[PDB]
Amino acid sequence: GVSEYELPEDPRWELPRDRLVLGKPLGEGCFGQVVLAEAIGLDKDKPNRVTKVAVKMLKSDATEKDLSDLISEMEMMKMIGKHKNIINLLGACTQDGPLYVIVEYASKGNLREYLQARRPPGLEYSYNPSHNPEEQLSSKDLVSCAYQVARGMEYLASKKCIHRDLAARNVLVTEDNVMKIADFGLARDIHHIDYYKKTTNGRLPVKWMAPEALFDRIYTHQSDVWSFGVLLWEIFTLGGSPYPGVPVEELFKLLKEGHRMDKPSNCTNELYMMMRDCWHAVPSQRPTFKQLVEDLDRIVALTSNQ
Numbered sequence: 001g002v003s004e005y006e007l008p009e010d011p012r013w014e015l016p017r018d019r020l021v022l023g024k025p026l027g028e029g030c031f032g033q034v035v036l037a038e039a040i041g042l043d044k045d046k047p048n049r050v051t052k053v054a055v056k057m058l059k060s061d062a063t064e065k066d067l068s069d070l071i072s073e074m075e076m077m078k079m080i081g082k083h084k085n086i087i088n089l090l091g092a093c094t095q096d097g098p099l100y101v102i103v104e105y106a107s108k109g110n111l112r113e114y115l116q117a118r119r120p121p122g123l124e125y126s127y128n129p130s131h132n133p134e135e136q137l138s139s140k141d142l143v144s145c146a147y148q149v150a151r152g153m154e155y156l157a158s159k160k161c162i163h164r165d166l167a168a169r170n171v172l173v174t175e176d177n178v179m180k181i182a183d184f185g186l187a188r189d190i191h192h193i194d195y196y197k198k199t200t201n202g203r204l205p206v207k208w209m210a211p212e213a214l215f216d217r218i219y220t221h222q223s224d225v226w227s228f229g230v231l232l233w234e235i236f237t238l239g240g241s242p243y244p245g246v247p248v249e250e251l252f253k254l255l256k257e258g259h260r261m262d263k264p265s266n267c268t269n270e271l272y273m274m275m276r277d278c279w280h281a282v283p284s285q286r287p288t289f290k291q292l293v294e295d296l297d298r299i300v301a302l303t304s305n306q
């Protein structure tokens, strides 16, 4: 029972449950549930204002370890602090019920789904799967997505945070088209990892791992930079799947032999070189997120929004 555990109450973050008006499901995961909610008076200055938020909670079959992870993720987000380009912590409910972790809500879904819905019916992209498509994104908008994500990672890096699974599905898009990085404070599994098991959404996270993380389970900022390269490829394929036609068992040998993904049809040479630099075999030779932010900042200014 949740009453049988000692939940860490933080007065600065604590919100009464009856201030939340729970709504539609936002998605699932390992053992966590996330719902949409309306928070009444999230800010003490405006107690009569409503704010759309996302609420994460434990499922019916959650164990003691799951609770420990959810708390761990919450306290981690506290320590890392706030940034525009990450999913921020807004509050928590630790009393009179199950643990609720309140975070920012992104209404336009993850980056893969966001981009796929805005795929032009053209030659250079796969088909738009959305039955209700949205307006095509400009070239500047695409580089802008990359910059924002890189900026968020640059911040997380400065807070000694290693994401270990940076991907398009782990980036969320707000109503104002702001890119926000998700799941950056997840507890690392203490057991060895299944290279072949899919996520609840059918994704193979193996395809984002750097070679050193893949072969020796070594995770650094440099390995995140590798992942950012794969994300860059995802953006300019508008939500494409990494290494098309390549099975996981063959991905081990291919990567070691120096094989990398081809440049997407709609992608500048300069942006592809950036992917390749991120995909450098030697971790120390990959660019830092600081350098990535500086380049992408320059490229955004020079990229046409026409």
Ligand SMILES: CCN1C(=O)N(c2c(F)c(OC)cc(OC)c2F)Cc2cnc3[nH]c(CN4CCOCC4)cc3c21
Pocket (backbone or CB within 6 Å): 025, 026, 027, 028, 034, 054, 055, 056, 073, 074, 087, 088, 101, 103, 104, 105, 106, 107, 108, 109, 110, 172, 181, 182, 183, 184, 185
């Ligand atoms: C992918 C599910 N999800 C989360 O997992 N969130 C989340 C969270 F609850 C959380 O609790 C600690 C930590 C996170 O990373 C820091 C999160 F990203 C916050 C979060 C915020 N907005 C979201 N929007 C969506 C997708 N919806 C689906 C249908 O409604 C429109 C879009 C998922 C989602 C969402």
